[PDB]
Design a protein around this nucleic acid. Structure first.
Lengths: 79, 97, 51, 56, 93, 108, 117, 97, 79
DNA sequence: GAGAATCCCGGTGCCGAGGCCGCTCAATTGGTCGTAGACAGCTCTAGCACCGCTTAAACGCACGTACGCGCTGTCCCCCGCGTTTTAACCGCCAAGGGGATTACTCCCTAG
DNA sequence: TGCACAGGATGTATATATCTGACACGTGCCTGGAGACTAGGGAGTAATCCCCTTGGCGGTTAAAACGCGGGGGACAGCGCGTACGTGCGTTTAAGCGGTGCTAGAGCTGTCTACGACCAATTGAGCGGCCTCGGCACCGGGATTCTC
């Protein structure tokens, strides 16, 4: 039930940010299946950086470097 | 007895969220999600607060960047409503498989 | 010295060629030893000092 | 560019939304940073003509 | 004087397929491939060592770079081969 | 007093010392440890051995005795982790795997 | 056409109810045999799906040889090229359909893996 | 005489071209094109035949990948014949503008 | 007759390498247009590597480094 | 023609965005030397240009037929809206576990 | 007018014979990796301080879940025409290949001046601390699409 954390009006909020007049009802679980692989793909390269740092906490410093390694370098939290 | 046409208030709130730039994702359920997806590899994980905000910004940017692409795929499909087949063709043309 | 299975502590007949972990029978190998996470094999070998 | 994007929206303060407005309009800068995600910047308002309803 | 890996990879092919011939262009592709793999692994290791404020490259940062670059079952077979090779080499006593 | 190279000390056929040379004056780090070229050499050993295995099986699958770049291309593109690693590289004189969409067939 | 199919389905259901009321033991044995056959077919399908995941298996080598032969080259060849495609989601859908058929056979048997080892 | 169905010998030509590994552009018009396209950036420029082969292989892979992307976008649009808007959609959703 | 130096069945050959069935007539000049916008980005980078090296001929090296740049890398000519 | 729903003008803490002093390393200056970059000079590979035979590939006109496209009737499934209700969030207190850092040491990696 | 038989023509089958044709092995060589010796400083261990972050309170409240009326949008279906596939006649200018010429790639030699290295120095940019006004927030009136 913890996987039901992301809520359907939040997916509607993300959809109306894209500027779409009509949303069908299957798009919510499609985006759920899309996002579930996607964040795990950066959790893959964050916790190994954390482990090689001999650290047991994650920070804003290794997650930006994981995104910079894969190829969506993000500004705002240093790096 | 004032009933709006469906889609007009959708476009109006689309405009309001076009001036808006705030976070559209609830914080604590996403924190629960990242803890339950990070627990599977090395347990008792401490998390910094700014990492969750960075994860929020990246998931929101990836969602809007995929949604503009699937909007283009849908308007190219001579339709107004999106489908799973537009989402698969967006993933195929952008190349993340 | 006698050889024991690293997972259960029973009599270890076999030994996996990949991560050098002794196991007891086929079900332990199929369920535990082969689809094991990386880094846990060294912690298993830490108990008898073979890391 | 960020200063001009500050003065056209009446503010004397630089916000990252003004930074997004300043990077995305210039096309050469836009493909310079076509792989860069900004934080708290938003997206430009573009409305498709087929999605725009009615006539004239 | 120029450098190529050709005799080593030739021997690797003779260990598993003795009766198999070779195009020179195939050596050009495979030499470029092994150089490209060495390229990405080495700068990933250097980048990781520059991250941890360390001035030394050892087996553990290239182990982490192999875990970063390669897919998971290739990563586990590669670190298995590397660990058995480095423990065989480390037994110089 | 005379002893042989580190490659057979580690039991490898790729040159450990040449890899150590390239890691030294490749300006990746100011200090290079001893065990790094052995590990890197073993990784290159396994990668080259697996690629040669798939190429040899592809060349056996066409009833030839030589390695054509078509065999390398089909061996890389047929297998899926080699598809993910080598997705962005175009093999010189490789060709394209045969595929037809199901709706484009004469279904009748 | 749909009404005739519905009447045929209702007649088949009435015939099945009459067979259950007449010979419950024979219908129960037939439904148990059908459930056993469906379970054996699903077990064979699961064994094939598990064997297809192995890269070093002989089935993977046969698939590679079939891909090489399809590259090397007819309605039968076109049908083989269509049927040689990868279908993991269709395999999951077929497993769900086989589980539904096994559940239907179990319901027909009702109407008419252990931890020790 | 005996004819063929339009779209059946085209399958045979498709499988012939997807077996054959040979080069599909004549070398002298391509070398004239790359010489007159390199003349704009810098004059008195000589060339190498290996560079010619590398350039031609790069552009041949580029039209090939773009072309099944266009074909997939076309069958996405419930059609068989490809058109120019399929190319523009493939370029826009592939990222190059 | 330089930009149309490639011929009408050449796009057909590159088409039937790509597994297509039916092809229109207006796409040939558009494929020639994406030829122009591809080869500008290739040989401008190639001539930067050329006259950086104090040479007025392009070798096999600078072209594959130019191809190495944008991520469309090609083997076979790496030596 | 009305009505939600906006845009626009004015009052309010506030708390988070500009100065300022203290000062501690880090940029600056000078001297020395040993090598690497630049230039001159050299030998031959290899790139450009053209002539000519062969011919398979390419242009052009003709036509025939599937397939792109225009229209149409229809389930029906998404969209606006009232009603619970349920978890998100803000204010806060306490712990203690984990990161930073100091400080010597020795070994192993540069030469 | 059709059919059956006989005779001639041609394919072929399998080992030749010449006979190239592109591959894998037996000798030089030179230079760079390996052994041995010296140094010093970079991880390594570890203890201690302090800071932030994980739980745990509780109220309350925007906001999600859920059910319900209704309306265009997606669905298949059918007809109209034309555009792409097919084909043969007629070029043409790609391809081979051959030769002739010369720029320019590439290697060597030699020099000297730019830059690493080292020791002393002074100043400027980080930081704790202090102070105040731009903007969000709230309240209420003008104004614009929509029905």
């Amino acid at each position: 039930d913890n996987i039901q954390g992301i809520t359907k009006p939040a997916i509607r909020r993300l959809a109306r940010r894209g500027g779409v007049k009509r949303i069908s009802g299957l798009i919510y679980e499609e985006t759920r299946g899309v996002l579930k692989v996607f964040l795990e793909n950066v959790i893959r390269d964050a916790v190994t950086y954390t482990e090689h740092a001999k650290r047991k906490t994650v920070t804003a410093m290794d997650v930006v470097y994981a995104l910079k390694r894969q190829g969506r370098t993000l500004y705002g939290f240093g790096g | 007895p004032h009933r709006y046409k469906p889609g007009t208030v959708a476009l109006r709130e689309i405009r309001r969220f076009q001036k808006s730039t705030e976070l559209l994702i609830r914080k604590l359920p996403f924190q629960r999600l990242v803890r339950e997806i990070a627990q599977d590899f090395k347990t008792d994980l401490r998390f910094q607060s700014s990492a969750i905000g960075a994860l929020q910004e990246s998931v929101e940017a990836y969602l809007v960047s995929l949604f503009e692409d699937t909007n283009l795929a849908a308007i190219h499909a001579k339709r107004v409503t999106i489908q799973k087949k537009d989402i698969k063709l967006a993933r195929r043309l952008r190349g993340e498989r | 010295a006698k050889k024991y299975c690293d997972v259960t502590g029973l009599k270890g007949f076999y030994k996996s060629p990949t991560n050098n972990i002794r196991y007891h029978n086929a079900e332990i190998y199929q369920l535990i030893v082969k689809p094991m996470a990386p880094g846990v094999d060294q912690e298993y070998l830490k108990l008898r000092g073979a890391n | 560019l960020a200063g001009n994007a500050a003065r056209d929206n009446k503010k004397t303060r630089i916000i990252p939304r003004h930074l997004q407005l300043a990077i995305r309009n210039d096309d050469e800068l836009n493909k310079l940073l076509g792989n860069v995600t900004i934080a708290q910047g938003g997206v430009l308002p573009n409305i498709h003509q087929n999605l725009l309803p009615k006539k004239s | 004087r120029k450098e190529t890996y050709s005799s080593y990879i030739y021997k690797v092919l003779k260990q598993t397929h003795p009766d198999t011939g070779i195009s020179q262009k195939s050596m050009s592709i495979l030499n470029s491939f092994v150089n490209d793999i060495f390229e990405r692994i080495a700068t990933e290791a250097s980048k990781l060592a520059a991250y941890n404020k360390k001035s030394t490259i050892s087996a553990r940062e290239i182990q982490t770079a192999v875990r970063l670059i390669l897919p998971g079952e290739l990563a586990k077979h590669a670190v298995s081969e590397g660990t058995r090779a480095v423990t065989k080499y480390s037994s110089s006593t | 007093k005379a002893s042989q190279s580190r490659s057979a000390k580690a039991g490898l056929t790729f040159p450990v010392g040449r890899v150590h040379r390239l890691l030294r004056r490749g300006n990746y780090a100011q200090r290079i440890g001893s065990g790094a070229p052995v590990y890197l050499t073993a990784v290159l050993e396994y990668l080259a051995a697996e690629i040669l295995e798939l190429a040899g099986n592809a060349a056996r699958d066409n009833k030839k005795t030589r390695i054509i770049p078509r065999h390398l291309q089909l061996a890389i593109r047929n297998d899926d982790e080699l598809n993910k690693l080598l997705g962005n590289v175009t093999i010189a004189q490789g060709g394209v795997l045969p595929n037809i969409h199901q709706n484009l067939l004469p279904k009748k | 056409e749909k009404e005739r199919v519905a009447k045929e389905e209702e007649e088949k259901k009435l015939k099945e109810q009459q067979w259950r009321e007449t010979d419950l033991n024979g219908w129960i044995k037939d439904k148990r045999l059908k459930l056993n056959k469906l379970i054996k077919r699903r077990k064979e399908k699961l064994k094939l799906r598990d064997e297809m995941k192995d890269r070093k298996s002989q089935v993977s080598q046969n698939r590679m040889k079939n891909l090489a032969s399809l590259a090397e080259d007819n309605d039968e060849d076109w049908l083989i090229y269509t049927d040689i495609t990868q279908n993991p989601e269709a395999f999951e859908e077929a497993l769900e359909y086989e589980y539904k058929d096994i559940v239907e056979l179990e319901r027909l048997l009702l109407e008419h893996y252990d931890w020790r080892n």
